[PDB]
Amino acid sequence: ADQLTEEQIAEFKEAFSLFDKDGDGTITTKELGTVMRSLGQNPTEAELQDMINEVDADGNGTIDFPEFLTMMARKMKDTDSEEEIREAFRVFDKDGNGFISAAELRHVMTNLGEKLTDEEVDEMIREADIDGDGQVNYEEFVTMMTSK
Ligand SMILES: [Ca+2]
Numbered sequence: 473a474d475q476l477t478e479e480q481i482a483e484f485k486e487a488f489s490l491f492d493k494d495g496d497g498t499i500t501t502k503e504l505g506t507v508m509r510s511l512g513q514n515p516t517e518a519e520l521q522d523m524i525n526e527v528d529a530d531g532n533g534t535i536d537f538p539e540f541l542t543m544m545a546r547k548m549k550d551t552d553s554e555e556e557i558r559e560a561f562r563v564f565d566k567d568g569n570g571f572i573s574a575a576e577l578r579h580v581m582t583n584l585g586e587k588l589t590d591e592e593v594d595e596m597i598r599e600a601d602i603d604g605d606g607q608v609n610y611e612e613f614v615t616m617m618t619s620k
């Protein structure tokens with residue numbers, strides 16, 4: 473739950489404003505409706521309905537300021553922890569071809585401080601290669617390097 477300042481909470485009302493088109497202080501499936509549709513995204517009832525269920529802590533069918541601010545924040549950390557392990561893959565992927573070779577891990581690992589034989593890097597790879605392509609994708613990465 474929030475600690476945040478008022479500079480923090482105010483960017484939050486502004487936010488909570490673009491959604492609350494009638495200015496009543498809550499957000500409806502129809503107001504969510506309409507926003508998803510500005511931003512070129514034409515959804516269906518279920519999705520909307522599911523998107524609200526989601527944020528609707530207390531189930532009156534609506535979302536007030538506080539339930540939004542929770543989510544908004546929770547999903548704030550997360551957009552960060554995302555990118556966090558995205559910058560990471562970014563150095564590890566020296567060629568940023570998309571996937572990380574074994575030779576690249578070794579380059580890094582030794583670009584930093586440890587000296588592995590190929591064997592020991594390949595052994596690194598395999599453990600983290602789920603699509604068994606021999607390389608390491610954001611996906612396998614992060615399945616790994618977060619967890620491990
Ligand atoms: Ca409203």
Ligand SMILES: [Ca+2]
Nearest residue numbers: 528532534535
């Ligand atoms: Ca609610």
Ligand SMILES: [Ca+2]
Nearest residue numbers: 568569571572
């Ligand atoms: Ca690469």
Ligand SMILES: [Ca+2]
Nearest residue numbers: 603605607608
């Ligand atoms: Ca792979």
